[PDB]
PHA granule-associated protein (Aeromonas hydrophila), 393 residues
Amino acid sequence: AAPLTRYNQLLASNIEQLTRLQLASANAYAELGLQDTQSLAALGTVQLETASQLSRQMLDDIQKLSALGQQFKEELDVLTADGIKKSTGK
Amino acid sequence: MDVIKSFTEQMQGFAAPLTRYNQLLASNIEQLTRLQLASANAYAELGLNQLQAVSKVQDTQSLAALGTVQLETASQLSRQMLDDIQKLSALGQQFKEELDVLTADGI
Amino acid sequence: MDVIKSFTEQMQGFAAPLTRYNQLLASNIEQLTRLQLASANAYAELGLNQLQAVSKVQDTQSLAALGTVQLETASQLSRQMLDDIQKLSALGQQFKEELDVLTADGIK
Amino acid sequence: FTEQMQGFAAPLTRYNQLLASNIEQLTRLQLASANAYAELGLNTQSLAALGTVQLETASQLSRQMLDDIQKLSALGQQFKEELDVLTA
C-alpha cells in the first residue's frame, strides 16, 4: 500500500489524461479536416491552455505526493534501524 | 516533388506548431511509461532478491544475516521511492517548461 | 447549432470511422496502462509484505514465518505473473478483433 | 529451490517490457494519425487511403504484439511446469 501505490497511481493517472488529450486533439483535427483560420488559431490556443492546466494539476499532485512520501520514509527508517540492530546480533 | 511541397508547408508554418504540440504529448506519455516500467522492475527485483535472500537465511540460523537483508531491502526501498518521486517531478517541470515555450511562441 | 452539425456529420459518415480508430488506440493505451499499474502494485505489495514479515522476525524459532511467507510469496507470485500474461494476451486478442471489424467495415 | 527464482526474473521483466513496448508504439500510432489529419486540415480519396493505411499499420503492430505474447506465454508456461514439478 502506502505512497508506493500512491505514486504508481499518479503515474498511470497522468498517462491516461495525456492520452485523452491526444485523442481530443486528433478528433479536433479530423473535424475541420473534413472564417476558419480564426478557429485554427483558437484550437492551438485551447489545446495549449488545457495541457497547461493539466501540468498545473500534475505538479500539485507531485507536491502532495512528496508529503505522503515523507511520512512513509519516516516509517521505513525505523525498519532499517531494526535491521541494523539485528545485523549486529550474530 | 515530395520535397518541394514539404519545404513550402514547412515555410507556411501551419502544421509545424500543432505537430509540435502532439509531438510534445507523445513524448511525455513515453517518458511516463518508461518511469512506470523502471518502478515496476525495481519493486520486482526487491521482492525477488528478498525471496532468494530469506531462502539462503532459511538454510542457516544467523539472525544477523536476516537483519542485514532487512536493512538492505528497507534502505533500498526508501532510495528507489525518493528517486522515483524526483524523476517524476523533473518530468513535470520540463513539461511545464515546454508548454510555456509553445504558448509564448503561439502569441 | 452544435447538434444539427454533429447529426449531419454522423450521417455523412466521413469523420466517424477515423474517430473510431483514434478511439480504439486511445482505449488500448488506457488498458495497457492499467494492466501495468496493476502489475506494479502487485510486485510492490508482495515485496512490502515480505519486508514487514522479515521485520516481525527475531527469536530464531521464527523460521516458521520464514517458510510460510516465503512459500506463500513464491506461489502467489507465480499466479500473479501467469494471470498477468493471460490478461495481456486477452488484450492483444481483443485488439486484433476490433481492428478486424474496423477493416471489414472500412472495406464495405 | 531458490535457484528457480532466476526463472522469475526473465518473464517478469519480459512481461513488463512488453507492456511498455505496446504502449509506446500505440502512442506513436496515435501521434502519426494525429498529425496526418492535421496535414489534411491545412489542405477525398486521400481520406479513404489514409484510413486504410492506419488500419493496416495497427494490424501489423497487432500481429507482432500477439506473436511476442505467444513467446512470452510459452516462457511462463514452461516455467510453471517446472515450478509445479519442483513443489511436488
In short: Chain A touches chain B through 48 residues (CB under 8 Å). The CA atoms of residues 29 and 53 of chain A lie 21 Å apart.
